[PDB]
Amino acid sequence: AIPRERVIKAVNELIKFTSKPEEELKKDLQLIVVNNKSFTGTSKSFKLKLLNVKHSFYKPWKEASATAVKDFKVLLILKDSDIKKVSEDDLFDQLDSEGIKVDEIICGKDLKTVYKAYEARNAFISQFSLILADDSIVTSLPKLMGGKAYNKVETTPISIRTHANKEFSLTTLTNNIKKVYMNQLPVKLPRGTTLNVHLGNLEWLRPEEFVDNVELISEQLIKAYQIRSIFIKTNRSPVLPLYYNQDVLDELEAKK
Amino acid sequence: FVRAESIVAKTLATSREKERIKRVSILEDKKAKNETQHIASGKDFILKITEGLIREKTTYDGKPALLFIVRVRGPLAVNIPNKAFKILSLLRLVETNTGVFVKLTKNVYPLLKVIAPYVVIGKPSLSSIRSLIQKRGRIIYKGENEAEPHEIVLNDNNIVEEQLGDHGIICVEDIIHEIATMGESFSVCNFFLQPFKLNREVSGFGSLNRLRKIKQREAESRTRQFSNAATAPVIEVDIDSLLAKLN
Amino acid sequence: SYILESRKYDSPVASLFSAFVFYVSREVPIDILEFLILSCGGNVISEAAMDQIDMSKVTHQIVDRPVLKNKVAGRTYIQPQWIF
Amino acid sequence: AAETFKLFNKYRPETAAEKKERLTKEAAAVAEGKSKQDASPKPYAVKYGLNHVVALIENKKAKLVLIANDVDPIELVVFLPALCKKMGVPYAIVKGKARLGTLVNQKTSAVAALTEVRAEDEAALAKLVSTIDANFADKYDEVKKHWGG
Amino acid sequence: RKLTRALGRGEVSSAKRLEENRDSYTLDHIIKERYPSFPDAIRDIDDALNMLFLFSNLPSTNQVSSKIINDAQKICNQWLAYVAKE
Amino acid sequence: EYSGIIYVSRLPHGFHEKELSKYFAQFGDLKEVRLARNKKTGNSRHYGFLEFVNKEDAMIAQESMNNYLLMGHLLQVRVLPKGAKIEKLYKYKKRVLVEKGITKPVKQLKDNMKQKHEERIKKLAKSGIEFKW
RNA sequence: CCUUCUCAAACAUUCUGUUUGGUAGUGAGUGAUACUCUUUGGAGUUAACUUGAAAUUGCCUUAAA
Structure with missing residues (x-):
């Protein structure tokens, strides 16, 4: 495992690096990067892998955005049939129990009709933080909503396995959204070797809990992609090796 | 003058078509070469859409049978792409509202999937094919006189003797057996028939029939579903009822 | 089809061949022989009829092809041109 | 004009049939369930009467104004282009x-006016105007100009 | 005329409404005058049946309105079924 | 006075030199057309140029279609001064990618990794952000 | 003057848990953080930020007439 005290001194040292010498809100947020052997080439993907975590930072994010201005919040898009079936009253029964709330539900006709006018499309979505979609529709979206959504890692859409096959029920979601809120995090596959993660903020939950979450993702991912090395920064800082893996470096010419 | 709006819609719909069909082309190549890790659904699918309408789902699970298939026009911006144009021109569906029979199998189940939006699909009935082949059917004859490249009506089972006696075939209800029962390899018939050139359902352009044309187009919008999705079900309809109109 | 429902005969041509059952080929023209057998009481069964769904059934059989094959040893057979 | 009418025919009005159908529906809903004239939605369609429009x-x-050219007591509408000019409002002659x-x-009606439109067509209208x-x-600003010489 | 007005305008809904809102003609008095009624009618059936059975084997095409053809087919086989059962 | 060169912009998608050619052949047998794509993953940056033959042909085309509307872009077209010389925009495709590597050996690049690991640690140390190892 | 890939499986039933796969974008720029390659040629991957779809230059036939 990585030294947790190396993590702890890293966070305190960048705290002092950020304390004294819009902009500060860009700077202060933490990024963690992984290099790996190679991602899938000649196949351009937009899917997201939902890596399990023990503690969500979205409740800190929501408590922060109650005060802040970017208005951390969610959007939903669905098939055409279910709008008459579902409403906000059910989730207002269920999700305030845990103390979260869905803003809106949308249909694809709404999406193509009123959030056309690409300026207005972007402007509608940009206030939203977390974008969520149907397991069916997820492949169809980018012809509709476009890659300005997909460039920003927050605004990149995510499916949900909605249809309890058959005769879909809402309860299948009112547990699943709780799962993905509290207990999972979506992460992207680019081309190449390099992969960024907008992991979180330091004003949110402690480095002690972030350390074990980082341990969880790293133990999950050392097997996942045969990964090369891991570094961290906060939005300018040159890379700090905290995991330096060279046993995987021996295989690169073995592949060829 | 050519109305650039019409031009760009033409090009765009052909762009959509060229896109989805190159998708399904190298998809079906990947199915055939059987590297089948990255596919949504490894299997085929079927929608028997019938009667504000009812929709029923299955797979082929072939088990092949016969089908009867007709060119309908559409949709409405699509200049001919080559990679469908050749295969449909083999299949002799040009000069639209022409109807032909087929026997399904796995080599050809993709061919219907590409030609799908250009065509209507369904399986026929015994009465339907009986009425069809008894009321219609057109054949060239060549021999011993009279070169005469004329499409000539079916009157003669002596023509069936002299042209299909190699197959042991007279008595055209034997052809009905070949079709209906998927008889002995059936390509004699499928090369022979000069298949049916059907009637325009509502000619018109009087006012009363303009209405009917619009009703027809609306029913087609209701009953046709061009999902274009490359895993989509194949569509099937009540051609028994529909040829009651069209025959 | 078009079954009739309610609510001396043609003497003799009505009810000729009464209590007859003809297993009729598909090759023969049905659309006229069926009018006559409906005129003079008799049942017909065509072989294409059952495609979708001990001394019982074979009373008579209708085939008027000149040549027929493969004929089997169990043929208690007439030809129908006499009936025609 | 063709684009204009592709737009406008979406926001065509209610006919009598649809009105009585709507009325029968909201007669169904007013009694037991609800109506604040919310049983039905806000309708959105053309405003067409002259007096009402100019009011x-x-x-x-x-948002937009359409003016017929061929009205026989043309004094009905001669003031209008000046009016929408002076108030800076999106008029056009048809x-x-x-x-x-x-x-x-x-x-016929001799004037068509838009004041309300659902959201999907806002930028379409925007480009239209x-x-x-x-x-x-730029080129029919000169409608008073071009005295010959 | 009203339908063409509705089509050069629109309000195709009312066009369909207008189509439903007509009363096609009947010929019962025509029959009851031209053949009074029964024995003369059955005297003169023959030329009807010839044209009827001709057209029911005649195929569908333009200039037909094949509604007519399937109508002829059913009325023909009604005749056949009656006279067969009798 | 102006030239037969014309500059059009504010184009939609699906509108390519195929379309321009078969359209503006209505107005004249063209001297030349050029279109603006991106060079990388080549798709339209929504403008182009043309000369049909003549100054008058360019003038009437511009006069006709200055404020012309379509699907919901509208083109703006303008007439240009004497010359003004369309000069560039070879028509760029979406290119096939080719892989020139990895020639250098695993052992040498691993030593590169070893030394630049330490290089990284010292540059963040001198930033200054101290780090052991 | 078209109108968008609207879902599939595996299991055991969960009145649904796990896994699998499934997208190739409007373009324009804004500034600017990191990793590969090979030789500078930067080819590919990396914080977010504007724009009314904006903008001037990177060897088939009846859907006729």
Whole structure:
């Protein structure tokens, strides 16, 4: 495992690096990067892998955005049939129990009709933080909503396995959204070797809990992609090796 | 003058078509070469859409049978792409509202999937094919006189003797057996028939029939579903009822 | 089809061949022989009829092809041109 | 014009059939369930009457204005282009009043006005008025100009 | 005329409404005058049946309105079924 | 006075030199057309140029279609001064990618990794952000 | 003057848990953080930020007439 005290001194040292010498809100947020052997080439993907975590930072994010201005919040898009079936009253029964709330539900006709006018499309979505979609529709979206959504890692859409096959029920979601809120995090596959993660903020939950979450993702991912090395920064800082893996470096010419 | 709006819609719909069909082309190549890790659904699918309408789902699970298939026009911006144009021109569906029979199998189940939006699909009935082949059917004859490249009506089972006696075939209800029962390899018939050139359902352009044309187009919008999705079900309809109109 | 429902005969041509059952080929023209057998009481069964769904059934059989094959040893057979 | 009518025919009005159908529905719903005239939605369609339209102007609320050329007591409408000029409002003259009779269900109307439109067509309208502004502000700004010489 | 007005305008809903809102003609008095009624009618059936059975084997095409053809087919086989069962 | 060169912009998608050619052949047998794509993953940056033959042909085309509307872009077209010389925009495709590597050996690049690991640690140390190892 | 890939499986039933796969974008720029390659040629991957879809230059036939 990585030294947790190396993590702890890293966070305190960048705290002092950020304390004294819009902009500060860009700077202060933490990024963690992984290099790996190679991602899938000649196949351009937009899917997201939902890596399990023990503690969500979205409740800190929501408590922060109650005060802040970017208005951390969610959007939903669905098939055409279910709008008459579902409403906000059910989730207002269920999700305030845990103390979260869905803003809106949308249909694809709404999406193509009123959030056309690409300026207005972007402007509608940009206030939203977390974008969520149907397991069916997820492949169809980018012809509709476009890659300005997909460039920003927050605004990149995510499916949900909605249809309890058959005769879909809402309860299948009112547990699943709780799962993905509290207990999972979506992460992207680019081309190449390099992969960024907008992991979180330091004003949110402690480095002690972030350390074990980082341990969880790293133990999950050392097997996942045969990964090369891991570094961290906060939005300018040159890379700090905290995991330096060279046993995987021996295989690169073995592949060829 | 050519109305650039019409031009760009033409090009765009052909762009959509060229896109989805190159998708399904190298998809079906990947199915055939059987590297089948990255596919949504490894299997085929079927929608028997019938009667504000009812929709029923299955797979082929072939088990092949016969089908009867007709060119309908559409949709409405699509200049001919080559990679469908050749295969449909083999299949002799040009000069639209022409109807032909087929026997399904796995080599050809993709061919219907590409030609799908250009065509209507369904399986026929015994009465339907009986009425069809008894009321219609057109054949060239060549021999011993009279070169005469004329499409000539079916009157003669002596023509069936002299042209299909190699197959042991007279008595055209034997052809009905070949079709209906998927008889002995059936390509004699499928090369022979000069298949049916059907009637325009509502000619018109009087006012009363303009209405009917619009009703027809609306029913087609209701009953046709061009999902274009490359895993989509194949569509099937009540051609028994529909040829009651069209025959 | 078009079954009739309610609510001396043609003497003799009505009810000729009464209590007859003809297993009729598909090759023969049905659309006229069926009018006559409906005129003079008799049942017909065509072989294409059952495609979708001990001394019982074979009373008579209708085939008027000149040549027929493969004929089997169990043929208690007439030809129908006499009936025609 | 063709684009204009592709737009407008979406926001065509309610006919009698649909009105009585709507009325029967909201008669069904007013009694037991609800009505604050919310049983039905806000309708959105053309405003077409002359007096009403020109009343809406100087409030002022019309997003677009369409003016027939061929009205026989032309003094009815001679003031209008000046009016929408002076109030800075999106007017344009059209060719044939019977067209407007098509789109608001009359023999003819001589004026069509838009004040309200659902959201999907806002930028479509925006480009539309930009087009006619690009037809009037530069080349039919000269409608008073071009004295011969 | 009203329908063409509705089509050069629109309000195709009312066009369909207008189509439903007509009363096609009947010929019962025509029959009851031209053949009074029964024995003369059955005297003169023959030329009807010839044209009827001709057209029911005649195929569908333009200039037909094949509604007519399937109507002829059913009325023909009604005749056949009656006279067969009798 | 102006030239037969014309500059059009504010184009939609699906509108390519195929379309321009078969359209503006209505107005004249063209001297030349050029279109603006991106060079990388080549798709339209929504403008182009043309000369049909003549100054008058360019003038009437511009006069006709200055404020012309379509699907919901509208083109703006303008007439240019004497010359003004369309000079560039070879028509760029979406290119096939080719892989020139990895020639250098695993052992040498691993030593590169070893030394630049330490290089990284010292540059963040001198930033200054101290780090052991 | 078209109108968008609207879902599939595996299991055991969960009145649904796990896994699998499934997208190739409007373009324009804004500034600027990191990793590969090979030789500078930067080819590919990396914080977010504007824009009314904006903008001037990177060897088939009846859907006729």
